[PDB]
Symmetry: none
Subunit: 75 residues, 8 copies
């Protein structure tokens, strides 16, 4: 199994709507709007790294409101 | 009382327009146009953290001219 | 209640031992060793902001093994 | 007169003692320990740019506890 | 021969579209979608530096889907 | 007198047109499109720091094609 | 299989000697000294994520000449 | 001809002495001590890219007083 945290910067004022969309996805276990350089922190759990790759490319990167991400995979 | 410093990037030709909105807000204690990656730095104070949350999420991040923000809460 | 995520950098080879010490703290709700710029991601919760201030400055940052912390307070 | 905000990263656990030292300097108008990538924010005011550079050089950079800094001159 | 690595950020939902354009170009030796701040990394080779200049300025930076690039020329 | 170098990131494919506009300004002495994290490097010379401040706010920041800048003042 | 690009900053003047050491490692597929903020780019391939972390930990991070690194896992 | 701008970080208090040594090199066309993240900005010109490669790696980065360099090649 894979557990990872994705830190994201979103367009100003869209963090809440983006968070709600992410929370509705099965891969997403937790999501919070936060203070600092990043706007959202999202915890995801997938069966494989390939699945995590697909979550990033097929879900995250197709959302225009998300601008910059940093992913940290638990080990 | 909660004190925080907010770094902001505004749309081109709008940093003065944003400063004018900021300098009319009760929560804004000081505001400066600065050199660098960010256009402005603003020191704000609210009674509680819940109030800061509302202020930043609603009055700052939804301001049309704002493109990005990074808030540093102080101790 | 205040929720925050602490991104940490520990001295080399101390990640695991630091994590076990953190997991013993009542404020720590989740802790993970991760691959990336940061060595650990820790979810903490306190009753007030003043308590978090105390926990981060007097407990967490005083741990000999911890070199850097970047705390993201949740809205 | 030159006004500038200096963001600094300190050795973990030394931010308060550093802030107190800084607060004792005449050029320092305000100083706060903050959450985020940076640990301290300081507002300084000097008569000239020359004096600002001398300040960070003779005082700031000569403080072992201070590890990294970013200066933002106010306009 | 000049070799360079180009880090690129593309518009949302366009990273595959860009990869398809890149993988049809003679100058592209390898191309990968990557995690992080950048969406793709591409290794290119040209006969001369003047050719690289033309290639990057005209075929890469004018590509409609490209939002930002950072090119690292190799020795 | 003040001499400074301004490093800038521009929208992809607009670096040349931005450079031409800057070169036409009396304050600008040299300008080059460059490889790396920055897209343009511009050398400016003004009578006072106040004039440099005005160049940044009234000229640079009103140009939508310019996205992020870093200014280094000679001393 | 996991493929990743590692960008590194080395002590000034030690980049080539470091590159040669890296090139002697089986996990390293290619390596180049480059212009820019980073001094070296290395492409590595390991069977697992676990092995990638062990690689940078046992080899990369244990090289005194290497001062800073940024890893980008390829999808 | 190849033109490049080298952004440098020197050991503390060595900026001026490093600058005078650089000004003596035929490749160096302009050199300035500056306020900011970098200590010096140096404009250099060589007849070919291969010569610049040699100049930066075998001359510049071998200078004991220089700690970091980020070279931006001009188009
Ligand atoms: C609510 C905080 C927002 C999202 C941003 N991260 C900031 O610090 O300003
Ligand atoms: C109290 C905050 C400390 C100093 C650090 N900046 C952090 O966010 O963890
Ligand atoms: C010509 C280079 C462009 C402007 C950008 N700086 C890059 O490195 O890709
Ligand atoms: C040859 C390039 C060196 C290593 C450094 N990255 C620079 O740009 O100055």
């Amino acid at each position: 199994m894979v557990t990872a945290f994705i830190l994201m910067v979103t367009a100003a004022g869209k963090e809440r709507e983006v968070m709600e969309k992410l929370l509705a996805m099965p891969e997403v276990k937790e999501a919070y709007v936060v203070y600092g350089e990043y706007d959202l922190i999202v915890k995801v759990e997938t069966d494989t790294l390939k699945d995590l790759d697909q979550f990033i490319t097929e879900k995250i990167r197709k959302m225009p409101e998300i601008q910059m991400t940093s992913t940290m995979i638990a080990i």
